[PDB]
Amino acid sequence: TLYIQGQDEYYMARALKLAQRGRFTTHPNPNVGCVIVKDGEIVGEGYHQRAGEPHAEVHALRMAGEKAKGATAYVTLEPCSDALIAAGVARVVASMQDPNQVAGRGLYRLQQAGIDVSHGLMMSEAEQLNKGFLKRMRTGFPYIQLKLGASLDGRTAMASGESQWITSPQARRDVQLLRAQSHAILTSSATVLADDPALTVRWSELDEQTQALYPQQNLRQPIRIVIDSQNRVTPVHRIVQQPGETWFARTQEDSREWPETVRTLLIPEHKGHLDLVVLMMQLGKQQINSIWVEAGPTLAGALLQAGLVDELIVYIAPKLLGSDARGLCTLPGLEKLADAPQFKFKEIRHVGPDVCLHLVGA
Amino acid sequence: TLYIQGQDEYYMARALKLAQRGRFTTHPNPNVGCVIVKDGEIVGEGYHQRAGEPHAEVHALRMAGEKAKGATAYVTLEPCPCCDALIAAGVARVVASMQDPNQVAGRGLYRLQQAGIDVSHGLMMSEAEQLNKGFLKRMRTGFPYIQLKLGASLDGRTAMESQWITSPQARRDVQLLRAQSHAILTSSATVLADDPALTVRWSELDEQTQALYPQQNLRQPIRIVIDSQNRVTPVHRIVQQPGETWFARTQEDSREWPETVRTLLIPEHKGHLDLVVLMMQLGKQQINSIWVEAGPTLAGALLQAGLVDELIVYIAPKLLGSDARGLCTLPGPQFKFKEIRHVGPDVCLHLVGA
Ligand SMILES: O=P(O)(O)OC[C@H]1O[C@@H](O)[C@H](O)[C@@H]1O
């Protein structure tokens, strides 16, 4: 009665924890956790590491071997569309049913062979495990995190230079970790021209996330997405010569030679500007789960007005900035924002000498 | 010692908790708490309520009467005439959290030691220190402790005027912070534009309501308004509230004002009213702590003058473009974070000088 329903919450939670372990390497695939239990003991465990790699269930099955037969297989996301049939499990508990609403019902496919199925357990948590992916699936759009670095009174970088203010070493290290689980990193050409950044993940800037999993060589570099209407960023720029891909969102094709890692996407304009909504969506088709935006004032405002921001992370430095510095703060152009997907605070924490304010449209 | 030390820490903590109790009514006097222990048991407690009323030690001593003979007194501040009370009561051992801020007057402990009383100081001073930031700073430097408050949207645009765009619970919070500050400083422009009352409304408190501060004990913080030119009128709401209002003037106003209005004459400095001298003058006037409700211009002035001890920043989850822009001026003092906390849908970030 209560014994089975209370013991489920132990093992499901264990499956969620394992799923979390692939969050850095898993794109465009979702995070899935699997735990197989036989009268009181975990006979098999597994989670999804990479896109080419085996699924979580496959891993746990290989581990469990013949011990899989008896009882319960705790999963995070409905399987299939196989193994658990031949494996011989009775009972599989899936945390959530699967987004894609058409062909997304092969949960019953297991009960077809008399398995005691069941879903919905700790779904709240399993949803939060795959925000990006689940949003790309349900809606057309990737999940967007806008990062801002401002001073006490809004304002950034002391000058207009569309460069991003990187508030502290601690703030940089914090962002690295947030970058590392993001599918892609987005920026504007104006930032690349002003900062010449690498926008990669340096492994050495991660903590005990370093061990828990994500060993050195497994390091996955998020896709680098750059907006420039005009093709102002030059192939000599640091960003394109980093390991991994870097995709330019161009108003028209470039004429030059770019390293093999570079790709281009063609995006129509909208009122003299490259259309961000079409872009976002085109990145959708491209299987992009989640974007981390390192933006100047202009880009950040455009995203907010275009209603494309899911959550914004604000790093505040303990400075008040001089006469009239830039920053999204107190600057004309942004008219109908008070009247557009407004946000609410989720978390606030110290980051070295800075504070980080998490908000989300909710 | 180990038990005695832990035992001391308990009683001092209590004396600190008691001192806090009069933090709303105590100005310009410090908050002070006293616990008197007679082999194991608290035989007298007291704290300071009001400038006119008795000291914490006296209150406690009257509750202890005869029981004070034997042993220990835990005081929040070096005591004191108020030093003859303890000797007369016949206590062995007193423990003060910190010595007198004034380093001319520090020998209050020597006085008791002479009567053969076992003295000691230092215990939980960090906390005593925090209990009286302003009074302590006024004794130390010539100056009051300035708390600058700012209210803004995410994009720093000015979003805090009681139909505030910020929030209810934020107003409730601000009211609490006003209620325990000695004075509220503002500028004419704020007074002219908003016509505020700059008072504490007892109805906007909470369990502080009980904590102490009954309705009639309500002490209205001193209202201080800057106007070089004498723009504010006797008919503005600010001057008709219960309590005093003080105009920082550059030259004497000629009008008839209520008995509760004073004016302080302040010299100029490069064609503006010299803020530093104002602060000094208020210091001499015994103002412990100024809670600033100003607009951008004044906020920038105080900052550039190096006069801001801490700042309390309220942010609302709004973003703006509603020609209500601004927050700070700064025709060019830098901070470090202390506490950050939620206040309903808003956050409030406390920062201090360094
Ligand atoms: O009228 P009360 O509620 O005292 O205060 C009005 C407020 O509105 C503004 O003018 C000031 O910043 C002040 O804090």
XYZ file of C-alpha atoms and ligand atoms in Angstrom:
730
model
C 0.000 0.000 0.000
C 2.080 2.926 1.335
C 5.308 0.855 1.373
C 5.540 0.643 -2.433
C 4.531 4.315 -2.974
C 7.134 5.587 -0.453
C 9.960 3.359 -1.698
C 9.272 4.590 -5.262
C 10.223 8.173 -4.263
C 13.631 6.943 -3.095
C 14.526 5.195 -6.338
C 12.920 7.685 -8.712
C 14.915 10.457 -7.007
C 18.005 8.345 -7.606
C 17.059 8.110 -11.305
C 16.609 11.899 -11.521
C 20.042 12.439 -9.942
C 21.663 10.146 -12.520
C 19.882 11.908 -15.376
C 21.329 15.198 -14.133
C 24.778 13.705 -14.652
C 24.603 14.049 -18.437
C 23.197 17.607 -18.557
C 26.472 18.988 -19.964
C 27.047 16.454 -22.742
C 23.558 15.395 -23.645
C 22.304 17.869 -26.335
C 20.334 17.628 -28.552
C 19.153 14.553 -26.638
C 17.306 14.855 -23.314
C 18.477 13.812 -19.855
C 17.176 10.369 -18.868
C 17.845 8.301 -15.749
C 17.372 4.598 -15.146
C 17.437 2.471 -12.001
C 16.507 -1.233 -11.895
C 15.434 -2.729 -8.523
C 15.091 -6.372 -7.390
C 13.779 -7.223 -3.912
C 15.461 -4.260 -2.172
C 18.562 -3.610 -4.298
C 19.724 -1.698 -7.348
C 20.817 -4.320 -9.857
C 21.321 -1.822 -12.705
C 21.884 1.936 -13.101
C 22.371 4.174 -16.097
C 21.868 7.551 -17.746
C 22.231 9.180 -21.157
C 25.714 10.602 -21.729
C 25.910 11.626 -25.430
C 23.725 11.665 -28.588
C 25.485 8.698 -30.256
C 25.860 6.809 -26.967
C 23.375 4.194 -25.634
C 20.190 5.329 -23.905
C 19.963 5.279 -20.073
C 17.833 2.122 -20.054
C 20.295 0.275 -22.289
C 23.047 1.112 -19.822
C 21.076 -0.023 -16.750
C 19.974 -3.204 -18.589
C 23.515 -4.194 -19.626
C 24.462 -3.736 -15.985
C 21.485 -5.593 -14.494
C 21.886 -8.644 -16.755
C 19.641 -11.561 -15.749
C 18.665 -9.787 -12.492
C 16.435 -7.455 -14.549
C 13.749 -10.206 -14.774
C 12.167 -9.943 -11.316
C 10.951 -6.423 -10.577
C 10.923 -2.668 -10.924
C 12.560 -0.437 -13.552
C 12.504 3.259 -12.556
C 12.733 5.624 -15.534
C 12.663 9.400 -16.022
C 11.049 9.647 -19.464
C 8.951 7.024 -21.282
C 11.145 4.730 -23.434
C 10.998 3.489 -27.076
C 9.777 5.227 -30.296
C 11.901 -3.042 -26.787
C 14.674 -3.904 -24.332
C 12.630 -4.049 -21.100
C 10.351 -6.616 -22.727
C 13.198 -9.041 -23.562
C 15.015 -8.051 -20.356
C 11.922 -9.441 -18.649
C 10.907 -6.705 -16.195
C 7.533 -6.674 -14.495
C 6.645 -3.067 -13.551
C 8.199 0.083 -15.053
C 7.638 3.467 -13.419
C 8.083 6.410 -15.797
C 8.231 9.923 -14.354
C 6.749 11.666 -17.402
C 5.016 10.469 -20.532
C 6.939 12.100 -23.461
C 6.157 15.418 -25.330
C 6.086 14.555 -29.087
C 1.637 14.528 -28.560
C 1.165 12.344 -31.673
C 3.390 9.229 -31.575
C 4.039 9.447 -27.845
C 2.097 6.577 -26.255
C 4.402 3.506 -26.336
C 4.261 3.542 -22.531
C 1.349 1.114 -22.939
C 3.437 -0.882 -25.470
C 5.128 -2.536 -22.451
C 1.814 -3.398 -20.744
C 1.115 -5.132 -24.067
C 3.423 -7.783 -22.586
C 1.729 -7.612 -19.154
C 4.041 -5.106 -17.479
C 2.639 -3.184 -14.483
C 3.240 0.341 -15.888
C 2.673 3.682 -14.095
C 3.541 7.342 -14.756
C 3.577 10.842 -13.270
C 5.914 10.282 -10.318
C 7.868 13.428 -9.379
C 7.037 14.822 -12.829
C 7.601 18.359 -11.597
C 11.294 17.451 -11.102
C 11.687 15.530 -14.386
C 10.203 18.490 -16.252
C 12.722 20.857 -14.654
C 15.417 18.380 -15.741
C 14.790 19.102 -19.468
C 13.394 22.654 -19.751
C 15.233 23.319 -23.018
C 14.417 20.056 -24.834
C 10.802 19.887 -23.592
C 10.174 23.485 -24.728
C 11.718 22.845 -28.151
C 9.418 19.871 -28.440
C 6.134 21.397 -27.259
C 6.619 24.845 -28.855
C 8.885 25.529 -31.861
C 11.390 27.479 -29.811
C 14.639 26.912 -27.890
C 14.831 27.943 -24.233
C 16.554 31.302 -23.786
C 18.583 32.560 -20.802
C 19.519 36.211 -21.044
C 22.572 37.123 -18.982
C 23.073 40.713 -17.976
C 25.903 42.284 -16.036
C 24.915 45.646 -14.569
C 25.874 48.049 -11.820
C 23.702 49.080 -8.865
C 21.886 51.635 -11.014
C 21.574 49.494 -14.155
C 24.154 50.664 -16.716
C 27.199 48.727 -18.056
C 30.869 48.925 -19.156
C 31.010 52.729 -18.567
C 30.802 53.400 -22.356
C 28.378 52.645 -25.226
C 30.745 50.045 -26.765
C 28.263 47.149 -27.167
C 30.784 45.051 -25.181
C 29.477 43.067 -22.208
C 30.555 43.960 -18.718
C 31.977 40.925 -16.965
C 31.563 41.957 -13.356
C 34.054 39.772 -11.429
C 36.250 36.641 -11.661
C 33.691 34.842 -9.501
C 30.924 35.994 -11.847
C 32.861 34.636 -14.802
C 33.362 31.279 -13.124
C 29.659 31.080 -12.285
C 28.694 31.765 -15.900
C 31.080 29.018 -17.126
C 29.053 26.415 -15.270
C 25.784 27.841 -16.655
C 27.289 27.949 -20.164
C 28.424 24.352 -19.880
C 24.927 22.876 -19.728
C 23.506 25.225 -22.348
C 23.114 23.744 -25.869
C 24.296 26.922 -27.548
C 25.763 30.353 -26.706
C 24.304 33.383 -28.538
C 25.840 36.844 -29.115
C 25.801 39.815 -31.529
C 28.597 40.787 -33.921
C 28.902 44.119 -32.112
C 30.077 42.140 -29.040
C 32.603 40.097 -31.064
C 33.998 43.280 -32.592
C 34.203 44.954 -29.172
C 35.481 42.052 -27.114
C 36.919 39.435 -29.510
C 35.779 36.690 -27.109
C 36.185 32.913 -27.308
C 32.752 32.185 -25.760
C 33.866 28.636 -24.974
C 33.893 26.660 -21.769
C 37.285 26.444 -20.115
C 37.119 23.220 -18.118
C 39.511 24.596 -15.459
C 36.826 27.092 -14.396
C 34.475 24.369 -13.191
C 34.479 23.059 -9.572
C 33.566 19.511 -8.279
C 31.173 19.362 -11.226
C 34.617 18.505 -12.621
C 34.612 15.099 -10.965
C 30.940 14.219 -10.263
C 31.072 13.503 -13.897
C 32.238 15.536 -16.909
C 35.805 14.313 -17.038
C 38.208 16.641 -18.918
C 38.118 14.974 -22.370
C 34.308 14.584 -22.396
C 34.114 18.415 -22.493
C 31.417 19.547 -24.921
C 31.664 23.024 -26.417
C 28.280 24.710 -26.857
C 27.466 25.774 -30.407
C 28.385 29.442 -30.889
C 25.671 31.520 -32.540
C 26.527 34.982 -33.832
C 24.161 37.596 -35.209
C 25.492 40.001 -37.835
C 23.228 41.507 -40.474
C 26.243 42.995 -42.207
C 29.114 40.522 -42.160
C 31.326 42.616 -39.874
C 32.965 39.761 -37.906
C 36.083 38.650 -39.767
C 37.373 35.042 -40.108
C 40.463 36.211 -38.187
C 38.322 36.655 -35.039
C 39.067 34.445 -32.009
C 35.539 33.049 -31.900
C 35.678 31.012 -35.117
C 39.046 29.437 -34.405
C 37.891 27.821 -31.158
C 37.295 24.055 -31.170
C 33.663 23.281 -32.083
C 31.104 24.923 -34.361
C 30.244 28.593 -34.705
C 27.094 29.489 -36.650
C 26.567 32.959 -38.089
C 23.062 34.359 -38.530
C 23.565 36.429 -41.675
C 21.246 38.723 -43.653
C 23.028 37.372 -46.736
C 25.853 34.920 -47.514
C 29.473 35.913 -46.819
C 32.045 35.961 -49.651
C 35.199 34.895 -47.735
C 36.738 31.604 -46.583
C 35.768 30.505 -43.076
C 37.253 27.512 -41.185
C 35.465 24.172 -41.608
C 33.834 24.598 -38.176
C 31.842 27.656 -39.352
C 28.288 27.377 -40.697
C 25.826 30.006 -41.843
C 22.053 30.450 -41.538
C 20.083 32.839 -43.752
C 17.542 34.966 -41.888
C 15.086 37.452 -43.412
C 14.912 40.996 -42.078
C 11.958 42.604 -40.333
C 11.752 46.411 -40.452
C 15.426 46.867 -41.442
C 16.670 44.425 -38.769
C 17.502 40.707 -38.746
C 14.365 38.912 -37.472
C 14.995 37.330 -34.088
C 11.762 35.311 -33.933
C 12.441 33.635 -37.298
C 16.036 33.021 -36.165
C 15.000 31.457 -32.856
C 12.629 29.166 -34.701
C 15.151 28.262 -37.378
C 17.467 27.203 -34.520
C 14.468 25.166 -33.354
C 14.423 23.169 -36.611
C 18.158 22.845 -35.974
C 17.482 20.806 -32.781
C 18.833 23.547 -30.470
C 17.460 22.896 -26.990
C 18.687 25.923 -25.048
C 20.582 29.160 -25.697
C 22.710 31.200 -23.275
C 22.802 34.842 -24.430
C 25.946 36.916 -23.821
C 24.583 40.257 -25.027
C 25.202 43.977 -25.276
C 22.405 46.464 -24.463
C 20.851 46.378 -27.967
C 20.535 42.584 -28.288
C 19.131 42.117 -24.766
C 16.471 44.753 -25.359
C 15.528 43.225 -28.695
C 15.103 39.778 -27.139
C 12.963 41.156 -24.331
C 10.702 43.136 -26.700
C 10.487 40.200 -29.108
C 9.189 38.211 -26.107
C 11.784 35.482 -26.650
C 13.373 35.453 -23.173
C 12.509 32.529 -20.900
C 14.678 33.505 -17.968
C 17.112 36.311 -17.255
C 20.212 36.095 -15.040
C 21.417 39.491 -13.786
C 24.846 39.899 -12.268
C 25.048 43.074 -10.210
C 28.360 44.627 -9.263
C 28.549 46.835 -6.176
C 29.322 49.915 -8.276
C 27.327 52.981 -9.086
C 28.259 54.008 -12.609
C 29.293 57.513 -13.671
C 27.495 60.495 -15.244
C 25.473 58.538 -17.807
C 26.856 55.118 -18.731
C 25.059 52.754 -21.119
C 23.343 49.556 -19.876
C 19.781 48.490 -20.719
C 18.984 50.982 -17.931
C 17.557 54.449 -18.612
C 18.029 54.383 -22.437
C 15.402 55.241 -25.188
C 14.213 52.752 -27.836
C 12.496 50.202 -25.585
C 8.873 51.447 -25.584
C 6.337 48.618 -25.029
C 8.182 46.424 -22.478
C 6.197 47.210 -19.318
C 3.495 45.774 -21.570
C 5.200 42.445 -22.502
C 6.071 39.081 -20.771
C 7.182 40.478 -17.393
C 9.170 38.409 -14.919
C 9.308 37.396 -11.283
C 12.304 36.669 -9.020
C 13.266 33.019 -8.577
C 16.584 33.035 -6.785
C 19.072 35.564 -5.453
C 22.539 34.614 -4.274
C 25.949 36.073 -3.550
C 28.623 35.438 -6.161
C 31.866 36.707 -4.683
C 31.575 40.484 -4.566
C 28.501 40.397 -6.828
C 24.903 39.239 -6.499
C 23.082 37.112 -9.002
C 19.405 37.759 -9.594
C 17.473 34.990 -11.305
C 14.171 35.988 -12.787
C 11.768 34.182 -15.082
C 8.719 35.330 -17.075
C 6.408 33.177 -14.924
C 35.970 28.658 32.141
C 34.239 26.730 29.336
C 30.830 26.600 31.076
C 31.201 30.158 32.469
C 32.034 31.470 29.000
C 29.002 29.746 27.446
C 26.919 30.939 30.368
C 28.185 34.520 29.841
C 27.325 34.327 26.134
C 23.753 33.386 26.946
C 23.160 36.268 29.307
C 24.906 38.822 27.083
C 22.886 37.618 24.104
C 19.808 38.279 26.236
C 21.042 41.765 27.150
C 21.550 42.420 23.430
C 18.047 41.206 22.650
C 16.645 43.564 25.285
C 18.639 46.554 24.034
C 17.171 46.015 20.554
C 13.808 46.470 22.136
C 14.038 50.269 22.349
C 15.608 50.765 18.926
C 12.498 52.724 17.875
C 12.361 55.271 20.711
C 15.842 55.565 22.070
C 17.326 58.336 19.905
C 19.499 60.329 20.526
C 20.421 58.022 23.407
C 21.882 54.632 22.599
C 20.030 51.377 22.946
C 21.404 49.652 26.021
C 20.323 46.403 27.717
C 21.096 44.970 31.160
C 20.733 41.494 32.701
C 21.480 40.806 36.367
C 22.232 37.248 37.464
C 22.304 35.947 41.029
C 23.867 32.463 41.220
C 22.008 30.995 38.259
C 18.910 33.107 37.956
C 17.936 36.332 36.238
C 16.992 38.597 39.124
C 16.704 41.828 37.160
C 16.358 42.801 33.524
C 16.110 46.251 31.949
C 16.700 48.267 28.760
C 16.631 51.885 27.546
C 13.335 53.111 26.102
C 13.339 56.898 25.836
C 15.815 59.788 26.158
C 13.921 61.233 29.160
C 13.406 57.903 31.014
C 16.005 55.921 33.074
C 18.974 53.866 31.860
C 18.917 50.089 31.310
C 21.118 49.454 34.389
C 18.817 51.481 36.642
C 15.682 49.670 35.427
C 17.337 46.307 36.001
C 18.699 47.372 39.396
C 15.242 48.301 40.648
C 13.885 44.927 39.617
C 16.746 43.175 41.398
C 16.660 45.346 44.510
C 18.290 43.219 47.219
C 19.104 40.297 44.895
C 21.766 42.421 43.178
C 24.094 42.068 46.216
C 25.825 38.844 45.216
C 26.972 38.570 41.628
C 26.981 39.456 37.970
C 25.770 42.298 35.712
C 25.840 41.951 31.917
C 25.783 45.340 30.207
C 25.486 46.091 26.552
C 27.609 49.239 26.822
C 30.097 50.492 29.465
C 27.742 51.973 32.048
C 26.937 55.591 33.028
C 25.483 59.539 37.299
C 24.843 55.844 36.532
C 28.120 54.240 37.713
C 27.386 54.749 41.421
C 24.211 52.617 41.109
C 26.059 49.335 40.582
C 28.459 50.002 43.439
C 25.576 50.935 45.769
C 23.659 47.776 44.753
C 26.750 45.809 45.809
C 27.307 43.551 42.784
C 30.507 41.601 42.346
C 31.449 41.309 38.646
C 30.074 43.323 35.731
C 30.599 42.376 32.089
C 30.298 45.106 29.429
C 30.074 44.229 25.747
C 32.043 47.263 24.663
C 33.651 50.263 26.332
C 32.423 53.832 25.861
C 32.969 55.049 22.261
C 33.858 58.596 23.405
C 38.836 57.292 23.684
C 38.522 60.022 26.348
C 35.794 58.272 28.380
C 36.704 54.585 28.608
C 37.576 54.339 32.294
C 33.974 53.574 33.386
C 35.274 50.071 34.088
C 38.185 51.361 36.200
C 35.619 53.067 38.456
C 33.917 49.752 39.285
C 37.158 47.776 39.524
C 38.136 50.214 42.290
C 35.089 49.188 44.331
C 36.550 45.662 44.053
C 34.081 44.631 41.359
C 35.306 42.044 38.833
C 35.241 43.783 35.439
C 35.696 42.615 31.854
C 34.887 43.853 28.331
C 34.745 42.626 24.745
C 32.111 39.867 24.864
C 29.970 40.010 21.687
C 31.040 43.566 20.926
C 30.592 42.905 17.208
C 26.878 42.723 18.055
C 26.861 45.699 20.431
C 28.658 47.638 17.723
C 25.884 46.704 15.257
C 23.209 47.669 17.782
C 24.184 51.361 17.736
C 25.896 52.000 14.362
C 24.804 55.647 14.275
C 25.240 56.819 17.844
C 28.599 55.081 17.818
C 29.667 56.829 14.592
C 28.462 60.222 15.858
C 30.542 59.822 19.000
C 33.461 58.562 16.926
C 33.433 60.846 13.884
C 31.428 64.057 14.095
C 28.830 62.556 11.780
C 25.454 60.792 11.609
C 25.172 57.411 9.878
C 23.506 57.857 6.501
C 21.324 55.136 4.950
C 20.524 55.888 1.370
C 17.509 54.049 -0.033
C 16.914 53.576 -3.734
C 13.984 51.969 -5.521
C 14.287 50.831 -9.101
C 13.159 48.445 -11.792
C 15.564 45.836 -13.224
C 16.737 48.386 -15.787
C 17.579 50.839 -12.984
C 14.729 53.178 -14.018
C 13.116 55.009 -11.095
C 10.291 52.724 -9.919
C 9.706 53.828 -6.301
C 4.315 58.186 -4.294
C 2.641 55.573 -2.060
C 0.867 53.958 -5.029
C 4.485 52.795 -5.512
C 5.276 50.675 -8.600
C 7.517 48.529 -6.343
C 5.141 46.825 -3.876
C 3.062 46.796 -0.685
C 5.477 44.630 1.376
C 8.282 46.921 0.299
C 6.406 49.950 1.706
C 5.785 47.911 4.870
C 9.521 47.237 4.957
C 10.521 50.876 4.349
C 8.102 51.920 7.101
C 9.927 49.587 9.485
C 13.295 51.078 8.533
C 12.004 54.660 8.911
C 10.528 53.812 12.301
C 13.950 53.106 13.804
C 15.989 55.835 12.141
C 16.537 59.111 14.024
C 15.781 61.341 11.022
C 14.493 61.245 7.469
C 16.375 63.453 5.032
C 14.888 64.585 1.735
C 15.133 67.412 -0.758
C 12.721 70.130 -1.792
C 12.307 68.602 -5.290
C 10.902 65.445 -3.738
C 8.717 67.498 -1.422
C 7.557 69.724 -4.286
C 6.838 66.905 -6.727
C 5.291 64.384 -4.342
C 4.156 66.433 -1.315
C 4.998 63.481 0.992
C 4.364 63.312 4.739
C 7.652 61.510 5.517
C 6.145 59.904 8.648
C 5.782 56.400 10.062
C 2.196 55.112 10.078
C 1.868 52.802 13.060
C -0.823 50.847 11.170
C 1.804 49.757 8.658
C 3.892 47.756 11.148
C 3.310 44.076 12.214
C 4.486 42.063 15.256
C 6.818 44.964 15.931
C 3.457 46.491 16.963
C 3.625 44.243 20.020
C 7.456 43.717 20.236
C 7.338 47.033 21.943
C 6.245 50.384 20.566
C 2.644 50.671 21.663
C 0.688 53.270 19.610
C 1.224 56.181 22.073
C 4.956 55.590 22.447
C 5.186 56.288 18.689
C 8.097 58.539 17.942
C 8.046 60.340 14.619
C 11.551 60.491 13.017
C 12.910 64.057 12.513
C 11.992 65.369 9.068
C 14.898 67.135 7.338
C 14.303 68.878 4.012
C 17.005 70.595 1.963
C 16.104 73.753 0.076
C 18.749 76.308 -0.859
C 16.046 78.477 -2.401
C 13.117 78.456 -0.054
C 10.632 76.698 -2.307
C 8.715 74.526 0.142
C 5.662 76.311 1.562
C 4.084 76.267 5.065
C 1.037 74.589 3.487
C 2.901 71.486 2.240
C 1.887 68.286 3.984
C 5.325 67.697 5.344
C 5.208 70.563 7.824
C 1.776 69.772 9.254
C 2.608 66.243 10.489
C 3.130 65.494 14.196
C 6.827 65.894 14.999
C 9.558 68.264 13.907
C 10.651 69.313 10.471
C 13.975 71.012 9.879
C 14.833 72.966 6.741
C 18.432 73.018 5.636
C 18.476 76.556 4.242
C 21.129 78.610 2.532
C 19.418 81.811 3.720
C 16.639 82.609 6.218
C 13.042 82.168 4.955
C 10.749 85.082 5.728
C 7.412 83.306 6.272
C 5.439 82.266 9.354
C 6.001 78.533 10.121
C 4.505 76.194 12.740
C 6.176 76.001 16.155
C 7.513 72.549 15.128
C 9.556 73.827 12.155
C 13.201 74.844 12.592
C 15.736 76.111 10.127
C 19.444 75.412 9.975
C 21.609 77.895 8.083
C 24.271 76.163 5.986
C 27.165 77.778 4.113
C 27.601 77.240 0.379
C 30.378 75.481 -1.498
C 30.786 76.292 -5.199
C 27.206 77.664 -5.464
C 25.470 74.644 -3.858
C 24.460 74.020 -0.221
C 27.508 72.360 1.392
C 26.226 68.894 2.338
C 29.227 67.965 4.499
C 28.662 70.954 6.798
C 24.962 70.041 6.965
C 25.896 66.537 8.124
C 28.294 68.008 10.682
C 25.675 70.424 11.940
C 23.127 67.642 12.271
C 25.785 65.656 14.086
C 26.160 68.524 16.580
C 22.370 68.566 16.742
C 22.774 64.940 17.943
C 21.204 63.201 14.929
C 22.308 59.554 15.109
C 20.976 58.305 11.786
C 19.460 59.684 8.628
C 17.262 57.564 6.400
C 17.344 59.332 3.011
C 14.222 59.367 0.811
C 15.559 61.560 -1.991
C 15.358 61.624 -5.797
C 18.249 61.114 -8.248
C 19.922 64.484 -7.900
C 20.351 64.430 -4.122
C 21.189 60.715 -4.109
C 24.097 61.497 -6.441
C 25.228 64.474 -4.382
C 25.453 62.482 -1.149
C 27.306 59.638 -2.872
C 29.896 61.957 -4.433
C 30.324 63.725 -1.104
C 31.324 60.399 0.444
C 28.539 60.731 2.974
C 26.647 57.473 2.481
C 27.296 54.757 5.059
C 25.039 52.138 3.622
C 22.484 51.844 0.875
C 19.320 49.835 0.700
C 18.300 48.931 -2.820
C 14.795 47.799 -3.686
C 14.324 46.161 -7.055
C 10.966 45.283 -8.594
C 10.616 42.619 -11.324
C 9.553 45.312 -13.771
C 11.330 46.668 -16.838
C 10.545 50.244 -17.972
C 10.528 52.857 -20.787
C 7.930 55.211 -19.346
C 9.658 58.652 -19.211
C 9.970 57.764 -15.511
C 13.658 57.043 -16.193
C 16.602 57.844 -13.924
C 17.902 56.801 -10.487
C 21.295 58.391 -9.922
C 23.030 61.518 -11.234
C 26.855 61.254 -10.614
C 28.669 64.142 -12.474
C 31.962 62.175 -12.132
C 32.763 56.001 -2.456
C 32.149 52.377 -3.508
C 30.378 49.517 -1.770
C 30.287 45.881 -0.713
C 27.215 43.663 -0.271
C 25.876 42.709 3.109
C 22.424 41.238 3.204
C 20.168 40.381 0.290
C 16.567 39.341 0.829
C 13.127 39.010 -0.687
C 10.365 41.480 0.050
C 7.252 40.071 -1.596
C 7.735 40.220 -5.375
C 10.717 42.478 -4.759
C 14.313 42.035 -3.629
C 16.142 44.352 -1.270
C 19.926 44.471 -1.443
C 21.790 46.009 1.485
C 25.226 47.410 0.805
C 27.724 49.087 3.070
C 30.707 51.468 2.528
C 33.422 48.770 2.947
O 4.308 60.305 2.310
P 5.167 59.176 2.833
O 4.530 57.819 2.726
O 5.796 59.414 4.175
O 6.423 59.064 1.822
C 6.341 59.411 0.431
C 7.523 58.847 -0.369
O 7.467 59.296 -1.729
C 8.611 60.086 -2.066
O 8.221 61.460 -2.054
C 9.652 59.888 -0.977
O 10.721 59.061 -1.454
C 8.894 59.243 0.173
O 9.580 58.085 0.659
